[PDB]
Amino acid sequence: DLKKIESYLDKLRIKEKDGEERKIYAEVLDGRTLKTLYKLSAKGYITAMGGVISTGKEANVFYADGVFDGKPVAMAVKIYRIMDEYLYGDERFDMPKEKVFIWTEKEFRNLERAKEAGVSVPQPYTYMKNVLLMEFIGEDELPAPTLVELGRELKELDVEGIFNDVVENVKRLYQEAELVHADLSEYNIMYIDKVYFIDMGQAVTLRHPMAESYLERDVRNIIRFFSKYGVKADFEEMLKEVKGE
Ligand SMILES: Nc1ncnc2c1ncn2[C@@H]1O[C@H](COP(=O)(O)OP(=O)(O)OP(=O)(O)O)[C@@H](O)[C@H]1O
Ligand SMILES: [Mn+2]
């Protein structure tokens, strides 16, 4: 399967000179993944695969130039490697390999749902098998920082403003998308000049048995994080603000 990978890496134009990229792509992705990326290029979604943005246990994220809705766009390409409590209980999905494809579709559908409700998430473009294409958040192929990445640079920003941005986005997600993120924290929120929520495969519908418990957890994470930056908030007030109580 190494021969297959190297071949697709050539066809995708992921070159030796493109830094450490070719070695990272060849280890983190597999032949069948790169086949799907090359079918996406052929179909006109991807013009050029770019740098490696993140490598994880569940997912890898890469930059690409691509085309969506007739125009050139910057893309985040998120790829799930080929979870349960967050799938089961979500009735939207009529229940190894196939499981990863559902999860991909799950995240895509959640992005679309959240976006339609007015939540600040990356514009979703398309998915295919284990690959999800979405709006690149950042500039000049540099990803926007997450809240953790921001660090004490937050002290120089309007932290309370950022907090209130976060809360408003959770409230829309809940009241208008009827979803709970379920892994909301400083690690999954990005900021350029407004916050964006990312990482939504696990998000569940308010029909899920655990939605309220996951929501309470999200709220506590956000109060915990912002307490370190001088923002005074109460759990009851934020929860009620979000749930419209
Ligand atoms: N749309 C995007 N635009 C720019 N950067 C992104 C985008 N999506 C993700 N990233 C970057 O890639 C990193 C990893 O993304 P993400 O949080 O979705 O997955 P993960 O935590 O590594 O694994 P998984 O999503 O499957 O749980 C993010 O912290 C962010 O820095
Ligand atoms: Mn994440």
Give a brief rundown of this model.
The PDB classes it as transferase. The entry lists the keywords RioK1, serine kinase, Manganese, Ribosome biogenesis. 40% of the residues lie in helices and 22% in strands.
End-to-end Cα distance: 56 Å
- What structural class do you assign from the helix and strand content? alpha+beta
The count of domains is 1
User: Radius of gyration from the CA trace?
Assistant: 19 Å
Determine the number of helices (DSSP H or I, runs of at least 4 residues). 8
Q: What is the ordering of alpha helices and beta strands?
A: HHHEEEHEEEEHHEEEEHH
Classify the helix fraction into a percent range: 25-40%
Number of distinct beta strands: 11
In percent, how much strand structure appears in the residues? 15-25%
| Overall spatial form | globular
Largest pleated sheet: 5 strands, antiparallel
The distinct bound ligands, ions and cofactors come out as: adenosine-5'-triphosphate, manganese (II) ion
Describe the strand arrangement of the main beta sheet, using strand numbers: 1-2-3-5-4
PDB class: transferase
Keywords: Rio1, RioK1, serine kinase, protein kinase, Manganese, Ribosome biogenesis, transferase
Assembly: monomeric
Entry title: Crystal Structure of full-legnth A.fulgidus Rio1 Serine Kinase bound to ATP and Mn2+ ions.
